[PDB]
Ligand SMILES: Cc1nc2ccc(C(=O)NCC(C)C)cc2n2c(-c3cc(OC(C)(C)C)ccc3Cl)nnc12
């Protein structure tokens with residue numbers, strides 16, 4: 054068994070220093086997708102240690118090692134919603150911890166829950182959205198469609214299934230109340246990754262940012278966790294052009310595969326899922342304007358040091374505007390043929 058061998062080294066070789074992973078590993082300029090996938094499990098452990106969670110919560114190391122590999126093994130390999138997504142999302146949570154002084158805003162247990170939620174938040178994704186679940190009458194829809202957020206409820210249930218696997222419950226020494234609290238947090242945070250959820254709380258996120266964050270306000274803590282989670286989920290937009298270009302390729306590959314399956318079921322895909330209709334520059338620009346930029350604008354409003362993140366997202370958006378003309382074929386194709394017209 055490969056996982057047993059991986060586990061054996063992960064446990065007995067010891068948790069490597071974060072600075073050994075990369076000199077700039079804790080910088081907003083670092084691209085965690087640059088890390089070899091074979092090194093990501095060790096890096097998860099390194100981050101957990103560097104944030105003092107292992108020490109503070111007296112996490113059993115054999116259990117944590119098993120847990121981390123189980124979570125990694127719990128992602129499938131669609132083009133975007135795979136383990137490297139969860140890892141880069143978790144890495145961004147670490148960056149926020151290192152760069153934004155979250156301990157002034159959130160409880161220890163809340164920040165811990167956020168990071169664990171980042172690792173788990175897309176568990177067992179099949180490369181299709183919630184609507185496809187319902188449309189295809191999937192098992193996941195049979196379970197959760199009456200509640201909404203079908204995939205996100207599944208992601209959360211998968212995280213719990215991993216905890217309930219023998220030798221994997223990294224929380225099982227917690228007090229009853231802390232155990233209860235952690236799982237409730239993971240619920241709310243993972244459910245916050247449903248865009249329907251974000252749209253529903255957006256006015257509140259705005260009011261919070263307007264009046265000013267009140268660390269004594271429990272609803273403010275919950276809203277902030279949702280915002281932070283969604284900013285981790287979108288963190289590929291905060292790197293350079295190459296990263297936003299690459300992730301566009303990945304997510305549209307994934308989208309168009311869904312659309313192809315929808316067409317085969319005789320249904321009309323959303324335009325952005327339809328490879329015959331989707332115009333990537335416009336769709337990406339729209340996603341940045343309506344989803345990504347307002348989330349980072351909110352983050353900047355709440356955290357002055359998050360300003361560079363918003364500015365990088367806005368810049369990447371402008372770069373999409375600049376390259377859009379390249380999606381129009383001028384002259385002939387690079388094979389000198391108009392055969393594609395037939
Ligand atoms: C690169 C990139 N393009 C996207 C393009 C379109 C959309 C989309 O759903 N548009 C809405 C429909 C109605 C037109 C999302 C996109 N997206 C996300 C994303 C954002 C999410 O929203 C929150 C809850 C804030 C995380 C949730 C899940 C995902 Cl996968 N992540 N990266 C992307």
Ligand SMILES: [Mg+2]
Nearest residue numbers: 174175246247
């Ligand atoms: Mg998701």
Ligand SMILES: [Zn+2]
Nearest residue numbers: 138174175286
């Ligand atoms: Zn995600």
